[PDB]
């Protein structure tokens, strides 16, 4: 036995759970049960005749990369069923041989070096297939002759001999070259796989393009927020590869590997809510039925569990605590139900260890300036905000996926509460894609996939506790512009809209919300203290509305209140919507089954061709009908301004004042004066201190932002980049935002 052999066995256990798998474990047993079932099902449908022209009639098409890739995945599952302790097919020599015969047939008639490396779809030929093939080779290594292995490994080397791509693609390349290097025992290729992780979009922080950013963002495909899609893939692969190499001659030594720990704390943690990975960072993947938010979240936790196996202190311990929290938090879907057999073994060990306490839940406001995203995490809820700009695209739709993703990143608000299933259970193929919560659009009209012409997108963070975001709207597909802002407080999210103008000749609307209701669609709801009808198929306008309360799908923790300063007229409808995943993901393997879900949808009609139209509402998570009325009796927020020049909100109780300045002209909002485009938030503690945070959301000001605060200070301290020129009678300072990339600068002033 050599070191390569030890690595192959290490990878093998990562795929099978190892020889120590406990058949007595309820979840493990079920996993090995399905595995054998799915294996027998496929094995049962195989054409074993030597005169065969396909392995599975359903997947015939030696040239259709999609079908071929699916054939190898099936063979991988069958190989797993024949090598996982506890499986009723474990050690089945007849199965093992039928798998190897299929591989030889695929080699001769489909996957070999006679094909173009860049033939559609390149991803299948260079990555997808090789990843499945390497696993089969490791699992059935001992039953593979030198002649057979050559045809398998030579082919993979032809398609992917090296690593030179970015992010997930680069990591995928690394794992392909790496596992093969272990199989054929090539120290040079294995060294190269390890080095691949030090490249673009992986360990080193990116300041542009694909990769992880210092502020926690992750981008893939140049301009798309992807922490939860391609981001999940890069984490999974990076984690698996690092674990494999750890402690060996090729163990990762690059010092930047410590960045991986930060990805967990800053890139993934803030975007997870009780097991769900927010859809706003999953790109076109929201259109995949097998990857709804909780299933993706489980995958993220699986990687964290993987890292906990080799990461150094105190990260390994923190990782275990995070995983334990999320596993206990997710009462929607069992974590063990959709992760590898080995993950189950490793996870249970963490959950069953009493010395490991679940980590605390995140509580903060975070601005992901690099990917036009923002998030608020609090006890009982989380709010995700998705924007786009000249830097980040509206939405991605390629390979026939996410066809209706139009407004998923156009000032879209996502509220997470005790109704963990809100965005799962076929939300995406049924929700009205033209009415994404929080957005302003031309009724029933789509927009194009691409970056916008406006740079003002982003926001400010006040010591990571509170914050405000804004997006300068101006669609390219049709005429519509507006200033949209969001102010995040403790349990109030205020949305303001101004300067809403259009010459499109299409009715303009702003979606207050659009929530999936219970199976009967009879969720109780109230307006101004009066109960509203709960029947499905009913449309109704609510005029002079001061507030609305909508009971959630859970007895407690999922109610939502809506307050309208100055009153409003709401257009609403409660209906059952049918659809299929095939409609938003035209892939043949996509389930065509029809599904029906119920929704309560509310929006404000701005009319056709508005000019300077506006809106203002307050989202009130987890308040009962009585509490919403109470709030309306003495609202805690006050709109300071809502013009096209400045939008500001004040929260008296907390002493908070947020203000988004849209032009490069001197303007004032309450105590705040700014000479340029900026996002600002101050917190005042009567006669004690005045805190202030400022950012240049445009990421294009190469000079400064001149701020003045209407208070007299005694002293101060400030982040470098801020220069104070006056404390009394008023506060004056400039913020050097040159190359700041949307970050927030903080200062604290001592008051007299």
Swiss-Prot record:
Q: Does the keyword Secreted apply?
A: yes
Molecular function terms, GO-annotated: calcium ion binding; D-mannose binding; xanthan lyase activity
Q: Which domain of life is it from?
A: Bacteria
Any inhibitors or activators noted? Activated by Co(2+) at 1 mM. Completely inhibited by Hg(2+) but not affected by other divalent cations. Intensely inhibited by NaCl and KCl at 150 mM, in particular by the Na(+) and K(+) ions but not the Cl(-) ions. Partially inhibited by iodoacetamide and N-ethylmaleimide at 1 mM but not by dithiothreitol, reduced glutathione or 2-mercaptoethanol.
Which Gene Ontology terms describe the biological processes this protein takes part in?
Answer: polysaccharide metabolic process
List the keywords (alphabetical): Calcium, Lyase, Metal-binding, Secreted, Signal
Annotated thermal dependence: Optimum temperature is 50 degrees Celsius. Stable at 4 degrees Celsius at pH 6.5 - 9. 60% loss of activity when incubated at 45 degrees Celsius and pH 7.0 for 10 minutes.
User: Could you say which residues bind Ca(2+) here?
Assistant: 490-492, 651
Active-site residues are 230
Q: Which family does it belong to?
A: Belongs to the polysaccharide lyase 8 family.
Miscellaneous comment as given in the Swiss-Prot or TrEMBL entry: The 99 kDa precursor is converted to a mature form (77 kDa) through the removal of a C-terminal (22 kDa) fragment without any loss in activity.
Task: Quote the function comment for this protein.
Answer: Plays a role in xanthan depolymerization pathway by cleaving the linkage between the terminal mannosyl and glucuronyl residues of the side chain of xanthan to liberate pyruvylated mannose. Is highly specific for pyruvylated side-chains of xanthan and is not effective with hyaluronate, chondroitin A, gellan, heparin or pectin.
The protein here is known as Xanthan lyase
Q: Which residues of the full protein are shown?
A: 26 to 777 of 930
């Amino acid at each position: 036995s050599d070191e390569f052999d030890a690595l192959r066995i290490k990878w093998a256990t990562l795929l099978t759970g190892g020889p120590a798998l406990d058949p007595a474990d309820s979840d493990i047993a079920a996993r090995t049960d399905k595995l054998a079932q799915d294996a027998n099902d496929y094995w049962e449908d195989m054409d074993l005749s030597s005169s065969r022209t396909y392995i599975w009639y359903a997947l015939r098409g030696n040239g259709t990369s999609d079908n071929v890739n699916a054939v190898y995945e099936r063979l991988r599952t069958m190989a797993l069923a024949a090598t996982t302790v506890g499986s009723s097919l474990y050690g089945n020599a007849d199965l093992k041989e039928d798998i190897l015969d299929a591989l030889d047939w695929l080699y001769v008639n489909s996957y070999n070096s006679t094909r173009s490396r860049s033939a559609y779809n390149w991803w299948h030929w260079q990555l997808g297939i090789p990843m499945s093939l390497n696993d089969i080779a490791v699992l059935l290594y001992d039953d593979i002759s030198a002649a057979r292995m050559a045809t398998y490994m030579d082919t993979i080397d032809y398609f992917t001999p090296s690593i030179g791509l970015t992010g997930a693609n680069r990591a995928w390349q690394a794992i392909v070259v790496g596992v093969r290097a272990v199989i054929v025992k090539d120290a040079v290729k294995l060294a190269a796989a390890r080095n691949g992780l030090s490249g673009t979009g992986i360990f080193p922080y990116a300041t542009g393009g694909d990769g992880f950013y210092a502020d926690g963002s992750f981008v893939q495909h140049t301009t798309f927020a992807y922490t939860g899609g391609y981001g999940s893939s890069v984490l999974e692969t990076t984690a698996n590869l690092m674990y494999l190499l750890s402690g060996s001659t090729w163990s990762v030594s690059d010092p930047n590997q410590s960045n991986v720990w930060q990805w967990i704390y800053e890139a993934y943690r803030p975007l997870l809510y009780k097991g769900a990975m927010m859809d706003m960072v999953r790109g076109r993947e929201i259109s995949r039925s097998y990857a709804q938010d909780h299933a993706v979240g489980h995958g993220i936790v699986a990687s964290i569990v993987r890292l906990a196996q080799f990461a150094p202190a105190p990260h390994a311990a923190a990782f275990k605590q995070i995983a334990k929290r999320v596993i206990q938090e997710d009462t929607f879907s069992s974590f063990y139900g959709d992760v590898s057999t080995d993950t189950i073994r490793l996870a249970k060990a963490i959950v069953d260890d009493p010395s490991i306490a679940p980590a605390a839940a995140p509580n903060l406001y975070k601005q992901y300036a690099a990917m036009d995203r923002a998030v608020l995490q609090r006890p009982g809820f989380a709010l995700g905000l998705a924007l786009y700009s000249t830097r980040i695209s509206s939405y991605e739709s390629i390979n026939s996926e996410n066809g209706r993703g139009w407004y998923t990143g156009a000032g879209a608000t996502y509220l997470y509460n005790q109704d963990l299933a809100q965005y799962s259970e076929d939300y995406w193929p049924t929700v009205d894609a033209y009415r994404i919560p929080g957005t302003t659009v031309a009724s029933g009209t789509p927009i194009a996939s691409g970056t916008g012409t406006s740079s003002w997108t982003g926001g400010v963070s006040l010591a990571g506790q509170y914050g405000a975001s804004g997006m300068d709207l101006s669609y390219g597909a049709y005429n519509l512009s507006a200033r949209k802002s969001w102010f995040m407080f403790d349990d109030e999210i205020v949305a303001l809209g101004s300067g809403i103008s259009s010459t499109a000749g299409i009715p303009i609307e702003t979606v207050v919300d659009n929530r999936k209701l219970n199976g009967a669609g009879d969720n109780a709801w109230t307006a101004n203290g009066a109960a509203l009808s709960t029947g499905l198929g009913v449309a109704q306008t609510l005029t002079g509305v001061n507030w609305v309360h909508l009971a959630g799908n859970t007895a407690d923790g999922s109610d939502i209140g809506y307050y309208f300063p100055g009153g409003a007229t709401l257009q609403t409808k409660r209906e059952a919507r049918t659809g299929t995943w095939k409609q938003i993901n035209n892939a043949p393997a996509t389930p065509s089954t029809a599904v029906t879900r119920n929704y309560e949808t509310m929006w404000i009609d701005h009319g056709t061709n508005p000019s300077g139209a506006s809106y203002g509402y307050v989202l009130l998570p987890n308040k009962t009908s009585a509490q919403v009325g109470a709030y309306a009796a003495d609202p805690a927020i006050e709109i300071v301004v809502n013009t096209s020049g400045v939008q500001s909100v004040k929260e008296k109780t907390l002493g908070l004042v947020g203000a988004n300045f849209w032009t490069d002209t001197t303007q004032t909002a309450d105590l705040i004066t700014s000479n340029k485009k900026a996002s600002v938030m101050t917190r005042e503690i009567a006669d004690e201190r005045l805190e202030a945070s400022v950012s240049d959301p445009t990421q294009a000001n190469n000079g400064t932002i001149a701020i003045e605060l209407a208070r007299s200070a005694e002293g101060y301290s400030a982040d470098p980049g801020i220069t104070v020129t006056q404390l009394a009678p008023t506060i004056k300072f400039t913020v050097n935002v040159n190359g700041a990339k949307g970050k927030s600068f903080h200062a604290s002033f001592q008051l007299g």
